[PDB]
Amino acid sequence: MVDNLRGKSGQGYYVEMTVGSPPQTLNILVDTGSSNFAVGAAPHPFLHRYYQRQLSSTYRDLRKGVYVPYTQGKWEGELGTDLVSIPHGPNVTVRANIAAITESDKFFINGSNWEGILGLAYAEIARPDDSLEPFFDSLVKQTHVPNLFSLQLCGGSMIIGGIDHSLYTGSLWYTPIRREWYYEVIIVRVEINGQDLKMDCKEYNYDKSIVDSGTTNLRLPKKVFEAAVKSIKAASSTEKFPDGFWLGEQLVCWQAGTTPWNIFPVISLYLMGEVTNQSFRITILPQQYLRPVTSQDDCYKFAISQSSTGTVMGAVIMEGFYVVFDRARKRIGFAVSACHVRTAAVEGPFVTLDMEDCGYNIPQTDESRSHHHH
Ligand SMILES: CCCc1scc(-c2cn[nH]c2)c1C[C@H](/N=C1\NC(C)(C)Cc2cc(Cl)ccc21)C1=NC(=O)CC=N1
Ligand code: NA
Ligand code: NA
Ligand SMILES: [Zn+2]
Ligand SMILES: [Zn+2]
Ligand SMILES: [Zn+2]
Protein backbone atom coordinates (compact mmCIF):
# COMPACT_ATOMS: atom_id res chain seq x y z
CA MET A 1 0.00 0.00 0.00
CA VAL A 2 3.01 2.39 0.28
CA ASP A 3 3.10 4.85 -2.70
CA ASN A 4 -0.52 4.09 -3.52
CA LEU A 5 -1.70 7.75 -4.00
CA ARG A 6 -1.05 10.40 -6.55
CA GLY A 7 -1.74 14.11 -6.78
CA LYS A 8 -1.09 17.55 -5.27
CA SER A 9 -2.69 20.07 -2.84
CA GLY A 10 -4.19 22.28 -5.57
CA GLN A 11 -6.29 19.51 -7.04
CA GLY A 12 -6.24 16.68 -4.47
CA TYR A 13 -4.90 13.20 -3.75
CA TYR A 14 -6.53 10.06 -5.17
CA VAL A 15 -6.30 6.26 -4.43
CA GLU A 16 -7.01 3.56 -7.11
CA MET A 17 -10.33 1.75 -6.53
CA THR A 18 -11.75 -1.13 -8.58
CA VAL A 19 -15.53 -1.17 -8.82
CA GLY A 20 -17.77 -3.94 -10.14
CA SER A 21 -17.25 -7.10 -12.03
CA PRO A 22 -15.89 -6.95 -14.65
CA PRO A 23 -13.50 -4.49 -12.91
CA GLN A 24 -13.53 -0.77 -13.63
CA THR A 25 -10.45 0.88 -12.06
CA LEU A 26 -11.01 4.56 -11.12
CA ASN A 27 -8.90 7.26 -9.57
CA ILE A 28 -10.65 8.50 -6.44
CA LEU A 29 -10.03 11.70 -4.45
CA VAL A 30 -9.50 10.88 -0.75
CA ASP A 31 -11.86 13.22 1.27
CA THR A 32 -11.80 13.12 5.12
CA GLY A 33 -14.24 15.96 5.20
CA SER A 34 -17.28 14.05 3.82
CA SER A 35 -18.86 10.63 4.04
CA ASN A 36 -20.17 9.56 0.57
CA PHE A 37 -18.47 7.34 -1.95
CA ALA A 38 -19.50 9.08 -5.17
CA VAL A 39 -18.17 8.57 -8.69
CA GLY A 40 -18.79 10.37 -12.05
CA ALA A 41 -21.08 8.07 -13.98
CA ALA A 42 -21.71 10.02 -17.23
CA PRO A 43 -19.53 11.94 -19.71
CA HIS A 44 -18.01 15.21 -18.66
CA PRO A 45 -15.54 17.62 -20.25
CA PHE A 46 -13.18 17.04 -17.27
CA LEU A 47 -13.46 13.25 -16.70
CA HIS A 48 -10.84 10.91 -18.16
CA ARG A 49 -13.01 7.94 -17.31
CA TYR A 50 -16.31 7.41 -15.51
CA TYR A 51 -18.28 4.58 -13.81
CA GLN A 52 -20.32 2.68 -16.40
CA ARG A 53 -23.03 1.02 -14.32
CA GLN A 54 -24.20 -0.80 -17.40
CA LEU A 55 -20.88 -2.70 -17.68
CA SER A 56 -21.03 -3.95 -14.12
CA SER A 57 -22.82 -7.27 -13.59
CA THR A 58 -22.68 -6.70 -9.79
CA TYR A 59 -24.26 -3.24 -9.65
CA ARG A 60 -27.59 -2.91 -7.85
CA ASP A 61 -29.76 0.16 -8.08
CA LEU A 62 -31.20 1.43 -4.80
CA ARG A 63 -33.93 3.47 -6.66
CA LYS A 64 -33.25 6.62 -4.67
CA GLY A 65 -31.57 9.89 -5.74
CA VAL A 66 -29.27 12.12 -3.64
CA TYR A 67 -28.61 15.78 -4.07
CA VAL A 68 -25.45 17.27 -2.39
CA PRO A 69 -25.18 21.05 -2.43
CA TYR A 70 -21.98 22.76 -1.46
CA THR A 71 -21.63 26.54 -0.85
CA GLN A 72 -20.44 26.78 -4.40
CA GLY A 73 -21.38 23.90 -6.67
CA LYS A 74 -23.07 20.53 -6.21
CA TRP A 75 -23.35 16.93 -7.24
CA GLU A 76 -26.40 14.70 -7.59
CA GLY A 77 -26.87 11.07 -8.70
CA GLU A 78 -28.43 7.74 -8.09
CA LEU A 79 -27.64 5.52 -5.13
CA GLY A 80 -26.70 1.88 -5.60
CA THR A 81 -24.26 -0.75 -4.38
CA ASP A 82 -21.41 -2.56 -6.09
CA LEU A 83 -18.36 -4.62 -5.30
CA VAL A 84 -15.31 -2.57 -4.47
CA SER A 85 -11.71 -3.49 -3.97
CA ILE A 86 -8.46 -1.53 -3.45
CA PRO A 87 -5.61 -2.87 -5.73
CA HIS A 88 -2.91 -1.48 -3.38
CA GLY A 89 -4.81 -2.14 -0.20
CA PRO A 90 -5.79 -5.16 1.74
CA ASN A 91 -6.71 -8.30 -0.19
CA VAL A 92 -10.47 -8.06 0.26
CA THR A 93 -13.69 -7.19 -1.67
CA VAL A 94 -16.66 -5.47 -0.14
CA ARG A 95 -20.10 -4.40 -1.21
CA ALA A 96 -20.46 -0.72 -0.69
CA ASN A 97 -22.80 2.14 -1.35
CA ILE A 98 -21.85 4.15 -4.39
CA ALA A 99 -23.48 7.25 -5.64
CA ALA A 100 -23.40 7.43 -9.42
CA ILE A 101 -22.98 11.06 -10.16
CA THR A 102 -25.22 11.99 -13.11
CA GLU A 103 -25.14 15.77 -12.90
CA SER A 104 -22.83 18.30 -11.27
CA ASP A 105 -21.82 21.95 -11.09
CA LYS A 106 -18.28 23.17 -10.25
CA PHE A 107 -17.33 19.80 -8.69
CA PHE A 108 -15.01 18.26 -11.30
CA ILE A 109 -12.02 20.39 -12.08
CA ASN A 110 -10.30 20.68 -15.42
CA GLY A 111 -7.38 18.24 -15.50
CA SER A 112 -7.59 16.75 -12.03
CA ASN A 113 -7.24 13.10 -13.01
CA TRP A 114 -9.83 11.92 -10.46
CA GLU A 115 -13.28 10.70 -11.30
CA GLY A 116 -14.86 10.40 -7.87
CA ILE A 117 -14.58 11.13 -4.15
CA LEU A 118 -14.12 8.73 -1.23
CA GLY A 119 -15.80 10.36 1.78
CA LEU A 120 -13.85 8.91 4.78
CA ALA A 121 -15.60 10.69 7.62
CA TYR A 122 -18.46 9.21 9.62
CA ALA A 123 -22.13 8.39 8.97
CA GLU A 124 -23.55 11.33 10.86
CA ILE A 125 -22.77 13.62 7.91
CA ALA A 126 -23.48 11.13 5.04
CA ARG A 127 -26.07 12.17 2.48
CA PRO A 128 -29.07 11.97 2.37
CA ASP A 129 -28.90 10.73 5.93
CA ASP A 130 -26.93 8.72 8.33
CA SER A 131 -28.37 5.39 7.34
CA LEU A 132 -26.25 5.30 4.07
CA GLU A 133 -23.22 3.35 5.42
CA PRO A 134 -19.94 5.06 4.36
CA PHE A 135 -17.31 3.05 2.56
CA PHE A 136 -14.79 2.57 5.41
CA ASP A 137 -17.53 1.37 7.78
CA SER A 138 -18.60 -1.27 5.15
CA LEU A 139 -14.90 -2.19 4.75
CA VAL A 140 -14.35 -2.83 8.45
CA LYS A 141 -17.69 -4.56 9.04
CA GLN A 142 -17.15 -6.97 6.14
CA THR A 143 -13.44 -7.92 6.52
CA HIS A 144 -11.05 -8.19 9.48
CA VAL A 145 -9.24 -5.03 8.37
CA PRO A 146 -8.19 -2.92 11.38
CA ASN A 147 -10.25 0.22 11.83
CA LEU A 148 -7.55 2.78 10.93
CA PHE A 149 -5.93 4.38 7.95
CA SER A 150 -3.21 6.89 7.38
CA LEU A 151 -2.52 9.57 4.85
CA GLN A 152 1.03 10.59 3.81
CA LEU A 153 0.65 13.34 1.23
CA CYS A 154 3.78 14.44 -0.70
CA GLY A 155 3.01 11.22 -4.63
CA GLY A 156 1.61 9.87 -1.30
CA SER A 157 0.36 6.76 0.57
CA MET A 158 -2.99 5.83 2.14
CA ILE A 159 -2.21 2.82 4.23
CA ILE A 160 -5.40 1.03 5.15
CA GLY A 161 -5.49 -0.97 8.40
CA GLY A 162 -1.94 -0.13 9.47
CA ILE A 163 0.76 2.29 10.48
CA ASP A 164 3.88 2.04 8.38
CA HIS A 165 6.95 3.36 10.38
CA SER A 166 8.99 3.92 7.23
CA LEU A 167 6.66 6.87 6.40
CA TYR A 168 7.59 9.03 9.37
CA THR A 169 10.42 10.07 11.64
CA GLY A 170 10.33 11.05 15.28
CA SER A 171 7.39 10.69 17.59
CA LEU A 172 3.77 10.02 16.63
CA TRP A 173 1.53 12.35 18.77
CA TYR A 174 -2.23 11.74 19.14
CA THR A 175 -5.10 14.18 19.62
CA PRO A 176 -8.59 12.88 20.46
CA ILE A 177 -11.36 12.83 17.95
CA ARG A 178 -13.77 15.09 19.75
CA ARG A 179 -16.93 13.62 18.16
CA GLU A 180 -17.30 11.17 15.30
CA TRP A 181 -18.87 13.17 12.45
CA TYR A 182 -16.21 15.19 10.77
CA TYR A 183 -12.73 14.27 12.10
CA GLU A 184 -13.27 16.99 14.77
CA VAL A 185 -10.34 18.01 16.96
CA ILE A 186 -9.58 20.77 19.51
CA ILE A 187 -6.97 23.53 19.12
CA VAL A 188 -5.75 24.84 22.57
CA ARG A 189 -3.28 27.59 21.42
CA VAL A 190 -1.95 29.32 18.31
CA GLU A 191 1.45 30.95 18.00
CA ILE A 192 2.71 32.92 15.06
CA ASN A 193 6.56 33.25 15.06
CA GLY A 194 6.69 32.38 18.78
CA GLN A 195 4.00 34.87 19.76
CA ASP A 196 0.78 33.73 21.28
CA LEU A 197 -2.28 35.06 19.51
CA LYS A 198 -3.77 35.36 23.02
CA MET A 199 -7.45 34.71 22.04
CA ASP A 200 -9.97 32.80 24.20
CA CYS A 201 -9.12 29.30 22.98
CA LYS A 202 -12.80 28.50 22.07
CA GLU A 203 -12.35 31.11 19.29
CA TYR A 204 -9.86 28.72 17.55
CA ASN A 205 -12.61 26.05 17.32
CA TYR A 206 -15.52 28.22 16.44
CA ASP A 207 -17.76 26.55 15.51
CA LYS A 208 -15.58 23.41 15.04
CA SER A 209 -12.02 22.39 14.00
CA ILE A 210 -11.55 19.52 11.59
CA VAL A 211 -8.93 17.62 9.64
CA ASP A 212 -9.97 17.71 5.92
CA SER A 213 -7.94 16.18 3.06
CA GLY A 214 -10.66 17.52 0.65
CA THR A 215 -9.89 21.17 1.47
CA THR A 216 -6.75 22.84 -0.04
CA ASN A 217 -6.27 25.70 2.46
CA LEU A 218 -5.79 26.18 6.11
CA ARG A 219 -9.07 27.85 6.82
CA LEU A 220 -9.57 29.96 10.01
CA PRO A 221 -12.57 31.50 11.74
CA LYS A 222 -13.00 35.22 10.95
CA LYS A 223 -11.44 36.67 14.16
CA VAL A 224 -8.60 34.19 14.09
CA PHE A 225 -7.98 34.79 10.31
CA GLU A 226 -7.78 38.54 11.02
CA ALA A 227 -5.34 38.08 13.91
CA ALA A 228 -3.11 35.76 11.92
CA VAL A 229 -3.07 38.03 8.91
CA LYS A 230 -2.21 41.06 11.10
CA SER A 231 0.73 39.00 12.56
CA ILE A 232 2.06 37.55 9.29
CA LYS A 233 1.84 41.00 7.71
CA ALA A 234 3.75 42.54 10.69
CA ALA A 235 6.50 40.03 10.27
CA SER A 236 6.67 40.56 6.49
CA SER A 237 6.25 44.35 6.62
CA THR A 238 9.35 45.08 4.48
CA GLU A 239 7.14 43.93 1.59
CA LYS A 240 3.83 45.75 1.03
CA PHE A 241 1.43 43.39 -0.75
CA PRO A 242 -1.82 44.25 -2.30
CA ASP A 243 -4.98 43.26 -0.47
CA GLY A 244 -5.82 40.68 -3.16
CA PHE A 245 -2.80 38.66 -2.10
CA TRP A 246 -4.03 38.35 1.52
CA LEU A 247 -7.46 37.41 0.11
CA GLY A 248 -5.84 34.51 -1.79
CA GLU A 249 -6.89 36.22 -5.08
CA GLN A 250 -3.45 37.34 -6.37
CA LEU A 251 0.10 36.06 -6.70
CA VAL A 252 3.15 37.87 -5.39
CA CYS A 253 6.52 37.34 -6.94
CA TRP A 254 10.29 37.56 -6.47
CA GLN A 255 13.08 36.94 -9.03
CA ALA A 256 13.75 33.18 -9.58
CA GLY A 257 15.20 31.81 -6.28
CA THR A 258 15.38 35.05 -4.27
CA THR A 259 12.16 34.71 -2.11
CA PRO A 260 12.78 36.12 1.41
CA TRP A 261 11.34 33.09 3.32
CA ASN A 262 12.72 34.40 6.62
CA ILE A 263 10.37 37.34 6.57
CA PHE A 264 7.40 34.87 6.81
CA PRO A 265 6.67 33.39 10.19
CA VAL A 266 6.08 29.73 11.23
CA ILE A 267 2.59 28.91 12.54
CA SER A 268 2.18 26.54 15.51
CA LEU A 269 -1.21 24.92 16.24
CA TYR A 270 -1.29 23.32 19.67
CA LEU A 271 -3.65 20.30 19.62
CA MET A 272 -5.27 18.71 22.77
CA GLY A 273 -3.24 15.79 24.03
CA GLU A 274 -4.65 12.42 25.05
CA VAL A 275 -3.72 13.29 28.64
CA THR A 276 -5.54 15.93 30.44
CA ASN A 277 -3.60 19.17 30.75
CA GLN A 278 -1.30 18.21 27.82
CA SER A 279 -0.98 19.42 24.26
CA PHE A 280 1.44 19.01 21.39
CA ARG A 281 2.13 21.34 18.52
CA ILE A 282 2.25 21.00 14.78
CA THR A 283 4.48 23.66 13.32
CA ILE A 284 3.73 24.89 9.81
CA LEU A 285 6.36 26.31 7.47
CA PRO A 286 5.81 29.31 5.17
CA GLN A 287 6.40 26.85 2.30
CA GLN A 288 3.09 25.18 3.30
CA TYR A 289 1.05 28.27 3.44
CA LEU A 290 2.59 30.26 0.64
CA ARG A 291 2.30 28.03 -2.43
CA PRO A 292 3.93 28.38 -5.88
CA VAL A 293 1.71 28.71 -9.01
CA THR A 294 5.95 35.60 -14.83
CA SER A 295 7.60 32.18 -15.42
CA GLN A 296 11.05 33.68 -14.94
CA ASP A 297 9.89 34.81 -11.46
CA ASP A 298 8.85 32.64 -8.50
CA CYS A 299 5.22 33.54 -7.78
CA TYR A 300 3.00 32.42 -4.86
CA LYS A 301 -0.56 32.27 -3.53
CA PHE A 302 -1.49 32.72 0.13
CA ALA A 303 -3.16 29.41 1.16
CA ILE A 304 -4.79 30.57 4.42
CA SER A 305 -8.39 31.77 4.04
CA GLN A 306 -11.26 32.99 6.19
CA SER A 307 -14.06 30.57 7.30
CA SER A 308 -17.58 30.89 8.80
CA THR A 309 -17.77 27.13 9.54
CA GLY A 310 -14.68 26.71 11.75
CA THR A 311 -11.00 25.88 11.34
CA VAL A 312 -10.16 23.54 8.51
CA MET A 313 -6.87 21.84 8.51
CA GLY A 314 -6.65 21.15 4.73
CA ALA A 315 -4.14 19.51 2.48
CA VAL A 316 -1.55 22.33 2.58
CA ILE A 317 -1.31 21.57 6.35
CA MET A 318 -1.47 17.73 6.21
CA GLU A 319 1.24 17.65 3.47
CA GLY A 320 4.00 18.16 6.01
CA PHE A 321 2.91 15.23 8.18
CA TYR A 322 2.12 11.51 8.44
CA VAL A 323 -1.51 11.66 9.70
CA VAL A 324 -3.07 8.56 11.32
CA PHE A 325 -6.85 8.35 11.46
CA ASP A 326 -7.07 5.81 14.30
CA ARG A 327 -10.85 5.45 14.37
CA ALA A 328 -10.56 2.32 16.63
CA ARG A 329 -9.08 4.44 19.41
CA LYS A 330 -11.00 7.60 18.46
CA ARG A 331 -7.82 9.74 17.91
CA ILE A 332 -5.73 11.27 15.10
CA GLY A 333 -1.92 11.04 15.12
CA PHE A 334 0.62 13.35 13.59
CA ALA A 335 4.33 12.79 12.99
CA VAL A 336 6.84 14.49 10.75
CA SER A 337 6.65 13.01 7.20
CA ALA A 338 9.65 11.14 5.79
CA CYS A 339 9.06 12.72 2.34
CA HIS A 340 11.37 15.78 1.70
CA VAL A 341 14.69 17.18 0.32
CA ARG A 342 13.19 25.00 9.68
CA THR A 343 11.28 21.63 9.26
CA ALA A 344 7.53 20.95 9.74
CA ALA A 345 7.71 19.75 13.34
CA VAL A 346 5.56 17.74 15.70
CA GLU A 347 6.56 18.55 19.30
CA GLY A 348 5.49 17.89 22.82
CA PRO A 349 4.33 17.60 25.45
CA PHE A 350 3.28 21.07 26.61
CA VAL A 351 1.65 21.04 30.00
CA THR A 352 -0.98 23.50 30.97
CA LEU A 353 -1.98 23.40 34.68
CA ASP A 354 -4.72 25.80 33.61
CA MET A 355 -7.00 23.02 32.35
CA GLU A 356 -9.35 25.01 29.96
CA ASP A 357 -12.14 23.56 27.75
CA CYS A 358 -11.47 25.01 24.26
CA GLY A 359 -14.37 23.22 22.40
CA TYR A 360 -17.36 25.14 21.24
CA ASN A 361 -20.86 23.77 21.68
CA ILE A 362 -22.86 24.32 18.51
CA PRO A 363 -26.40 25.47 19.41
CA GLN A 364 -28.78 22.53 19.11
CA THR A 365 -31.43 23.14 16.43
CA ASP A 366 -34.91 21.58 16.78
CA GLU A 367 -34.36 19.61 13.52
CA SER A 368 -31.22 18.06 15.09
CA ARG A 369 -33.01 17.33 18.36
CA SER A 370 -35.88 15.75 16.47
CA HIS A 371 -33.90 12.79 14.90
CA HIS A 372 -33.75 9.29 16.45
CA HIS A 373 -30.58 7.28 16.10
CA HIS A 374 -31.70 3.69 16.84
C1 LIG B 1 -6.97 19.17 -1.51
C2 LIG B 1 -8.04 18.87 -2.58
C3 LIG B 1 -8.91 20.11 -2.72
C4 LIG B 1 -9.87 20.20 -3.90
S1 LIG B 1 -10.04 18.94 -5.11
C5 LIG B 1 -11.21 19.63 -6.13
C6 LIG B 1 -11.45 20.86 -5.57
C7 LIG B 1 -12.47 21.68 -6.22
C8 LIG B 1 -12.47 23.06 -6.16
N1 LIG B 1 -13.60 23.40 -6.83
N2 LIG B 1 -14.28 22.24 -7.30
C9 LIG B 1 -13.56 21.15 -6.90
C10 LIG B 1 -10.75 21.30 -4.29
C11 LIG B 1 -10.89 22.59 -3.49
C12 LIG B 1 -11.78 22.31 -2.26
N3 LIG B 1 -13.14 22.22 -2.69
C13 LIG B 1 -13.85 21.10 -2.79
N4 LIG B 1 -13.48 20.00 -2.31
C14 LIG B 1 -14.28 18.90 -2.76
C15 LIG B 1 -13.85 17.88 -1.63
C16 LIG B 1 -13.83 17.96 -3.88
C17 LIG B 1 -15.72 18.92 -2.39
C18 LIG B 1 -16.12 20.12 -3.21
C19 LIG B 1 -17.37 20.13 -3.82
C20 LIG B 1 -17.68 21.24 -4.63
CL1 LIG B 1 -19.29 21.23 -5.43
C21 LIG B 1 -16.75 22.29 -4.86
C22 LIG B 1 -15.49 22.26 -4.24
C23 LIG B 1 -15.20 21.16 -3.44
C24 LIG B 1 -11.73 23.53 -1.35
N5 LIG B 1 -10.56 24.05 -0.98
C25 LIG B 1 -10.47 25.17 -0.19
O1 LIG B 1 -9.34 25.58 0.15
C26 LIG B 1 -11.65 25.84 0.20
C27 LIG B 1 -12.87 25.28 -0.22
N6 LIG B 1 -12.86 24.16 -1.00
NA1 NA C 1 -23.81 -2.74 1.57
NA1 NA D 1 -21.04 14.71 -14.35
ZN1 LIG E 1 -7.81 12.31 -20.06
ZN1 LIG F 1 -37.44 6.30 17.11
ZN1 LIG G 1 -28.66 8.18 13.29
From Swiss-Prot:
<keyword id="KW-1015">Disulfide bond</keyword>
<dbReference type="GO" id="GO:0045121">
    <property type="term" value="C:membrane raft"/>
</dbReference>
<keyword id="KW-0256">Endoplasmic reticulum</keyword>
<keyword id="KW-0597">Phosphoprotein</keyword>
<dbReference type="GO" id="GO:0001540">
    <property type="term" value="F:amyloid-beta binding"/>
</dbReference>
<dbReference type="GO" id="GO:0120283">
    <property type="term" value="F:protein serine/threonine kinase binding"/>
</dbReference>
<dbReference type="GO" id="GO:0070931">
    <property type="term" value="C:Golgi-associated vesicle lumen"/>
</dbReference>
<dbReference type="GO" id="GO:0019899">
    <property type="term" value="F:enzyme binding"/>
</dbReference>
<feature type="topological domain" description="Extracellular">
    <location>
        <begin position="1"/>
        <end position="368"/>
    </location>
</feature>
<dbReference type="GO" id="GO:0005768">
    <property type="term" value="C:endosome"/>
</dbReference>
<comment type="subunit">
    <text>Monomer. Interacts with RTN1; RTN2; RTN3 and RTN4; the interaction leads to inhibition of amyloid precursor protein processing. Interacts with SNX6. Interacts with PCSK9. Interacts with NAT8 and NAT8B. Interacts with BIN1. Interacts (via extracellular domain) with ADAM10 (via extracellular domain). Interacts with SORL1; this interaction may affect binding with APP and hence reduce APP cleavage. Interacts with NRDC AND NRG1.</text>
</comment>
<dbReference type="GO" id="GO:0006508">
    <property type="term" value="P:proteolysis"/>
</dbReference>
<dbReference type="GO" id="GO:0055037">
    <property type="term" value="C:recycling endosome"/>
</dbReference>
<feature type="active site">
    <location>
        <position position="31"/>
    </location>
</feature>
<dbReference type="GO" id="GO:0016020">
    <property type="term" value="C:membrane"/>
</dbReference>
<feature type="modified residue" description="N6-acetyllysine">
    <location>
        <position position="230"/>
    </location>
</feature>
<keyword id="KW-0007">Acetylation</keyword>
<dbReference type="GO" id="GO:0010288">
    <property type="term" value="P:response to lead ion"/>
</dbReference>
<dbReference type="GO" id="GO:0005794">
    <property type="term" value="C:Golgi apparatus"/>
</dbReference>
<dbReference type="GO" id="GO:0005769">
    <property type="term" value="C:early endosome"/>
</dbReference>
<dbReference type="GO" id="GO:1904646">
    <property type="term" value="P:cellular response to amyloid-beta"/>
</dbReference>
<keyword id="KW-1017">Isopeptide bond</keyword>
<dbReference type="GO" id="GO:0009986">
    <property type="term" value="C:cell surface"/>
</dbReference>
<dbReference type="GO" id="GO:0050966">
    <property type="term" value="P:detection of mechanical stimulus involved in sensory perception of pain"/>
</dbReference>
<dbReference type="GO" id="GO:0008798">
    <property type="term" value="F:beta-aspartyl-peptidase activity"/>
</dbReference>
<dbReference type="GO" id="GO:0005764">
    <property type="term" value="C:lysosome"/>
</dbReference>
<dbReference type="GO" id="GO:0004175">
    <property type="term" value="F:endopeptidase activity"/>
</dbReference>
<keyword id="KW-0333">Golgi apparatus</keyword>
<dbReference type="GO" id="GO:0008021">
    <property type="term" value="C:synaptic vesicle"/>
</dbReference>
<dbReference type="GO" id="GO:0140448">
    <property type="term" value="P:signaling receptor ligand precursor processing"/>
</dbReference>
<dbReference type="GO" id="GO:0030425">
    <property type="term" value="C:dendrite"/>
</dbReference>
<dbReference type="GO" id="GO:0071287">
    <property type="term" value="P:cellular response to manganese ion"/>
</dbReference>
<dbReference type="GO" id="GO:0098686">
    <property type="term" value="C:hippocampal mossy fiber to CA3 synapse"/>
</dbReference>
<keyword id="KW-0967">Endosome</keyword>
<keyword id="KW-0865">Zymogen</keyword>
<keyword id="KW-0378">Hydrolase</keyword>
<feature type="disulfide bond">
    <location>
        <begin position="253"/>
        <end position="299"/>
    </location>
</feature>
<dbReference type="GO" id="GO:0005886">
    <property type="term" value="C:plasma membrane"/>
</dbReference>
<feature type="disulfide bond">
    <location>
        <begin position="201"/>
        <end position="358"/>
    </location>
</feature>
<dbReference type="GO" id="GO:0099171">
    <property type="term" value="P:presynaptic modulation of chemical synaptic transmission"/>
</dbReference>
<feature type="active site">
    <location>
        <position position="212"/>
    </location>
</feature>
<feature type="glycosylation site" description="N-linked (GlcNAc...) asparagine">
    <location>
        <position position="110"/>
    </location>
</feature>
